[PDB]
Amino acid sequence: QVQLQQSGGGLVQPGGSLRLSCAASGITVSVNYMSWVRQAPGKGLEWVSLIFAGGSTFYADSVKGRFTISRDNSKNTLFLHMNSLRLEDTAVYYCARDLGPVGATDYWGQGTLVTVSSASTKGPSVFPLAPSSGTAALGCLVKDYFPEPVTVSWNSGALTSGVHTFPAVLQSSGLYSLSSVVTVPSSSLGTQTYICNVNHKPSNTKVDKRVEPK
Amino acid sequence: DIVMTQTPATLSVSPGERATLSCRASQSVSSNLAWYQQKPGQAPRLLIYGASTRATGIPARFSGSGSETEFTLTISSLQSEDFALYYCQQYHTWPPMYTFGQGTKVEIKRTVAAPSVFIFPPSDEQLKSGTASVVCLLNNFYPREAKVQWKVDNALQSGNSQESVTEQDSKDSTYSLSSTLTLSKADYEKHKVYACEVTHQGLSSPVTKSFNRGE
Amino acid sequence: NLCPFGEVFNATRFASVYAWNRKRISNCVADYSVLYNSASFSTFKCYGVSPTKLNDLCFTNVYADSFVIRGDEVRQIAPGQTGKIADYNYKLPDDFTGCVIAWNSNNLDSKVGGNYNYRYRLFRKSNLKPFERDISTEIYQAGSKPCNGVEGFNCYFPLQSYGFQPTNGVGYQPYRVVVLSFEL
Ligand SMILES: *[C@@H]1O[C@H](CO)[C@@H](O)[C@H](O)[C@H]1NC(C)=O
């Protein structure tokens, strides 16, 4: 079939090296224009490098001297060697076959994420958010953890309606911070108990925290 | 590089209506332009190439037009599966590179909805660590455009908060905003009143929800 | 005898870069110092020899290559260069001994609505040897499924036409190129 399966992504310290793979199916890498496109989290797409079928290699000005594109005809796999990584290079990297005016960039890879940071797997810190004075609202605060993700549920999944789990935010301390709230009728406050279930598989952290007003 | 500018940044359309997306190039790219659709968590998918040629397997409701510096992607009848991000791409500089537009988010349209504003003071378990995180919540509002102004004793706080917006809800198609005001425990007692101003299209006046430290 | 350079530079029609013309001239004399100071040429770079001292040297044959590319691709007509033109159309050797002449031809080769006569090779399995000419129009087999000379998916015509309009940018406007190489 026509497939561009990727691999090799993960966590890398700033300045180190990481090599990405782009296994091709049905499409011959050594006979096509093969490029590497990265997309910063929440930003647009950026072209990184490109190799010709004849062996010519071109790179963007932001990765020149640090990145190296290559291929292996026997395995039919495109590669990208990333050196001297920094906080810039943290993005989701795609590989794609390009056709210019004969089909543009038709087939893409599924994407492999490259995260560049310098912090071990720290467990989260779950703090409650008590409601104050129509309906009320309460939630939990999952602060200072690394890396993504953290799964937060309420009443072990028994409370689905009215829950909003916000995406994490990368604070300047390198760690993450996530918020999860839920609006409930103000009547069932003392009768119905609320417990948020925070799980952190990387650090192996499972904490249940009770939320109640002051 | 040739700069690609897409307009609008966000397009709110109802299913069945027509969606029109523009993309302007800083320099002439003739007809060397492509359009892509990208759903959350998925790779981009080619829709149009050569400014107007549909890719293989793309429904007939998609159509591209334009040349030189102005281009347009048109979805004649928007379907529920068509709500995603859309990117244009010039490849007149393809001999080596190519540039994308910043993207246009097509989302389900709905009536203006005012946000329910809640404010949460920092917990006691956190104050024992040295930091105090004040949290303000905007729940189930529309559109996404909503400004959150942190007032500490009626002093605007800049460079102190971080916001966070959710995707469109599956049933009400609204958003939820979470701004977190983090500061040191020492600086938490240097002030008294912690507020949270909220300006939104569904509010005739900016709504403020505040509290007093120790009340 | 004098070198018939007027038939090369002042030629009414130039060839596409994928099928670059070559004019073999048989040991003549010419005032190369006159061509250098001519304001008609916007690009004139010689390698391995100076432009003024060309009339002070001798050779068996001087080859006059001629083609048309866009402005941005003029920088590829040089030793040790890569790109769509240097790899798949016209390649100069790393030890090139000669000169590279080029001038804007927007008033000549650009037509309102596009002049699509000039073409270039877009697909090729490997780069070109120096001074190699590839004019094959066989359908480029990009996948494992052969093409049988039929365009389609993974089956592309290896040539693409230049879009030369007068309103194009200088990097995309047509530039006529003449390369002089010598043989001792
Ligand atoms: C082309 O012809 C003009 C006169 O028509 C002459 O001035 C010019 O030098 C010629 N160019 C060359 C390269 O001989």
Numbering used by the authors:
A (entry chain H): 1 to 133, 139 to 219
B (entry chain L): 1 to 215
C (entry chain E): 334 to 517
Paper text:
In this paper we have generated a panel of 28 potent human monoclonal antibodies from BA.4 or BA.5 infected volunteers. 26 mAb binds to the RBD and 2 to the NTD. To achieve this, mutations are targeted at the sites of binding of potent mAbs, most of which bind either on or in close proximity to the ACE2 interacting surface of the RBD and are exemplified by the Fab/RBD structures we present for four representative mAbs. Our structures show that the four most broadly neutralizing anti-BA.4/5 mAbs have substantial (12–21 residues) overlap with the ACE2 footprint.
BA.4/5-35 is highly unusual in that it belongs to the so-called public family of antibodies IGHV3-66, closely related to IGHV3-53, and binds a well-characterized epitope. The structure reveals how BA.4/5-35 dodges these mutations to remain highly cross-reactive. Of published Fabs in the PDB the BA.4/5-35 HC is most similar to Omi-322 (83% sequence identity for Vh). A substitution (D100G) in the HC creates space for the side chain of residue W94 of the light chain to stack against the peptide of HC residue 100. The overall effect is that HC contacts are maintained, but the LC is lifted away from the escape mutations, conferring broad cross-reactivity. A recently described but low-frequency mutation in BQ.1.1, A475V, which maps to the BA.4/5-35 binding site, leads to a significant fall in activity. Mutations of many of these footprint residues (417, 445–446, 460, 477, 484, 486, 498, 501 and 505) have no effect on these mAbs, whilst other mutations show moderate effects (3- to 7-fold for G476S in BS.1 variant on BA.4/5-1, BA.4/5-2 and BA.4/5-35) or target just one of the mAbs, (A475V impacts BA.4/5-35 and Q493R knocks out BA.4/5-9). However, all four Fabs have close contact with residues 455 and 456 and the L455F and F456L double “FLip” mutations, present in some of the recent fastest spreading variants, knock out all of them.
